[PDB]
Ligand binder design. Sequence first.
Ligand SMILES: Nc1ncnc2c1ncn2[C@@H]1O[C@H](COP(=O)(O)O)[C@@H](O)[C@H]1O
Ligand SMILES: *P(=O)(O)OCC(C)(C)[C@@H](O)C(=O)NCCC(=O)NCCS
Lengths: 116, 516, 76, 459
Amino acid sequence: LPQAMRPERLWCLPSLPLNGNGKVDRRRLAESMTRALGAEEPLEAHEQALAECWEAVLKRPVRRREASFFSLGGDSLLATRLLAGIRERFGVRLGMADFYRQPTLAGLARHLQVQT
Amino acid sequence: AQDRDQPFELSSVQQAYWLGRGAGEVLGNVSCHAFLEFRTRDVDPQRLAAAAECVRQRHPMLRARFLDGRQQILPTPPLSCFDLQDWRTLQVDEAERDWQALRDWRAHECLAVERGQVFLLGLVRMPGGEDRLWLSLDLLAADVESLRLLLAELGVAYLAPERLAEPPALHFADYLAHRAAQRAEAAARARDYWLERLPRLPDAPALPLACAPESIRQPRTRRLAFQLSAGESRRLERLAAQHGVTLSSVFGCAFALVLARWSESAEFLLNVPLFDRHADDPRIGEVIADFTTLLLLECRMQAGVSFAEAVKSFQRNLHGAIDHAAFPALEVLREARRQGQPRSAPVVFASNLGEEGFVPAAFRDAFGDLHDMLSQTPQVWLDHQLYRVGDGILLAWDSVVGLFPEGLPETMFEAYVGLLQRLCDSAWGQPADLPLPWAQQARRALLNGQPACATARTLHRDFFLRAAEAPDADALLYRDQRVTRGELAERALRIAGGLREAGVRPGDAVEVSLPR
Amino acid sequence: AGIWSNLQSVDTVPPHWRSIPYGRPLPGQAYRVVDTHGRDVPDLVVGELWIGGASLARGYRNDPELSARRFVHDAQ
Amino acid sequence: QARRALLNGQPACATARTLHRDFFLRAAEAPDADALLYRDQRVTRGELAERALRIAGGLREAGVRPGDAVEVSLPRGPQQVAAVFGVLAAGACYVPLDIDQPPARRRLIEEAAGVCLAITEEDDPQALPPRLDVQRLLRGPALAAPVPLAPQASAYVIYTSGSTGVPKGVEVSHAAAINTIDALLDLLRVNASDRLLAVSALDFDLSVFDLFGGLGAGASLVLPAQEQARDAAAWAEAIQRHAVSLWNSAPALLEMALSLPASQADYRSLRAVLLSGDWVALDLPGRLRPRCAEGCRLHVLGGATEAGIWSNLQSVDTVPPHWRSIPYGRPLPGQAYRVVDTHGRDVPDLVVGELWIGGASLARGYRNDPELSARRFVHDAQGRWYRTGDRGRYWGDGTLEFLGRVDQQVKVRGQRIELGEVEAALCAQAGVESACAAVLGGGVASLGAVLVPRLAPRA
Ligand SMILES: Nc1ncnc2c1ncn2[C@@H]1O[C@H](COP(=O)(O)O)[C@@H](O)[C@H]1O
Ligand SMILES: *P(=O)(O)OCC(C)(C)[C@@H](O)C(=O)NCCC(=O)NCCS
């Protein structure tokens, strides 16, 4: 599942509810999850390293671990400047295959952790 | 001077296909090269070798090295520009089968643009006495009209290098340092229009897929091809003029109707390359460089309108969005990604419909007209191009293998061709609406045709007969007790009499609110 | 449709299914897959499903207006 | 609608291909085999293939190229056959204007077909279509194989009659022609033992079956000569000599053949029979059953050129009594019949309406009349339809009864006239062979009618 088909919040049951006429109760399910709904600083060394890189790419404040490359300046051209900066920062073979399934700074920090 | 030998930035669309080499880029991992296959009889490999490396030395863009999202030009590249396969030595059928190995490879090939190899001519000299003169050009170097300029220069450089008129001196980087900055007010002024529309732009053309576009590691392009006759072309052109619309607008409208009919949505983005010449030098029609800007045409294709309305509409939409094209499709789609909406135009309409013939006359004379071709355009499911071939017109649909359901681009194209000559052969006051491909609609008429096995009767009629036939036979079983057909029937008929007594009568409605 | 409009028999599941499909339209009845404009869409093209033919219910009882939106008439 | 959708839904037999393909296959397979039989001489597939491809290379030498178009105006014979195959193998579209046709009608078409070359006995580059001798074209180089075509390109432009005032060119794609042909080949099992008879003029599309049907199946197209264009005695000899199995004609030409007694004219080689393009008299199968072979297998076929060679087939072993015309049977595989009202809505069964022919057998349109094509061809939710102007009606078994035309089935100062019932009632007189009727010129706009006697030959 790519990004817009993530359950951007998620839930579970022992057994799905059943509608009067026997269906899975997708009405009740949607509305229960609806009622069950009702950024933060760089703390990790990988988050700081990404903020050094991302800010040097974007020229704009990456004061946030929940920063999203897409909304900040999502371009695949700028992803080359990011790729080069992190390829220098850690000696890792970063690429868009890794990055664009994990496009937020706290999600990408997990890729720096594995040093590959 | 953004001096001739310095590293310099990629022009807008050059970034798009440059990033299209990225292995994880959406339907990336590929060149964006055109591969041309010609046939001709017997042509000198020494003239060809000399011609290829002549046009490289004449035209700096054909020797451009690509690294780091920029282009830097090699004074002479490390890698040879002509792939001579002098197979006059082979047997014919071995040479053919081995040509299929070379063909697939070269035609799908990620060309070595890092080593200056944007342009790669070649020739398999088939021992049937047929020189399959061929041409892999990465469109990174060149606009497809600039590819016919490459053919113009090659045709001359083979025929008579003495007739090569001028080194066309305006350097492509100096043109970019001009034209991009010159248009930059119009880039912002259009970026306004696009920004203010990013939610209201349509989607990608929602065609059917057997693989989602990110989920194949190499888009093997398959061309689909149809040479419209010289006469079909004339009839399109007369009708185009009689409706006041460019021939490119007609094929574009018709394609947008097919794509609409094959999309989940009749509104979608398709990309149009605009082969821009609005720099003041008359040799800008002569420099072999990527003057393309890419236009994000948000086409919106109603039913029920005549084709004449749909094309006048499509032409207004094309000519209007051409004003807004000074902000490039690339940066619009980046702006949509910056808005967090992953729109794209992964389908292209490349209307190379200048009047001269696509292969320019010198090259047609030197070898032959275009025999076959492929476009390896990245991020694009379906690269539809058009080319004048003879005084006829080649329709190319450079689909991607396996991305679509098998047979779909074939069928969808056979329906597109069927439409385009329904536009030759019936006036455009006819409905824009296509037929389905008849074989599909015939299958569906069979499915929908299956006879009514209905022994059409009131819904109870069987049961009250089954009851009269076997009154003791079990009809319902419950927690222990069971009701025979006769019992259920007599009970139901007592209720029925109770209901006529209660003033209920036929077709009037009765709630039933009983535990099972 | 009354109770139904299809029978996909399922002796065994072929590997290209992504959901169990609606089978052949049942005897005496039919399906179209259609555009927003009601024109039939090609094979594999996703569109709205319309049911037709000799199994159709009459309408939404005392609601004629939803019945004219949700039931439609064509040369088909 | 369920029954009619089953019929219109019957799937294509189309091996969807360039119309000529299978003859060039059959020729590469057996160059020795009889493509044609003629006045006394016969022509093999190899001869015809090379002759046609020499004409094609002559035609590319004459600048004819993919879907440009060529008048073909030759005496019936191997020169005519090699000419149309040579136009088709140039990838071009042939415009047969059979040379019996007057120069007056031809001259309307010489511009209207957009016809950029003509084939004749004659070289004359100063003619309106620059005009070429079939024999000088036979002196051309061979194209070693036919020019490549995808099937949707134009194959032929058969021209409708001068009755229209300005003739129209029915431009038929290879796909349309070959869907029709294939869809019929599969019912006829046309094979190496078969020999067709081209009683067809070339400006009539039964010849397109005679050609690409017969020769694509490798069955031999037996030719009458040009001076044999109505010579039923030569046709009878040809059936008996060149052993014809697959008669194909308008029914008047089989009435012409059956006018000759069995002892003089042995048809017992006819394995199956195709009748077309005009009313079959109901009794005609009844007459034909003793004359043709055992397993007589008449087929009566329907529809204009705008839906390929035909669009229907009714097999006849014997007439079921309630037929008042031999119906169009089922629509042919891959093509369809709607019957519509005037307002384009489909009529119910047994209601007379206009016949609309649909699907994988339709003509492109009219060759340079897109404007009239938009009236005679239409597009619905049900896709493309050719509007025949024929009148007819479905039956309860989906059989499609034929009931004349929008012309002919007209008012005359009052009530609608069933002129087919005028024909039938004059044919219900004893001693009538056939009968006919019309509506006339002048301010009175009068009805008119015509009788023909039967003679009953004797010794
Ligand atoms: N079997 C037939 N019986 C009566 N009319 C026919 C028959 N076959 C074709 N026609 C129709 O009468 C005209 C003859 O065909 P055509 O010369 O192709 O235009 C057209 O209007 C046909 O649709
Ligand atoms: P990046 O942010 O620079 O590029 C991302 C992209 C969304 C523009 C890209 O993935 C894409 O969809 N490219 C389309 C390229 C195209 O249509 N080229 C036609 C060349 S004529």
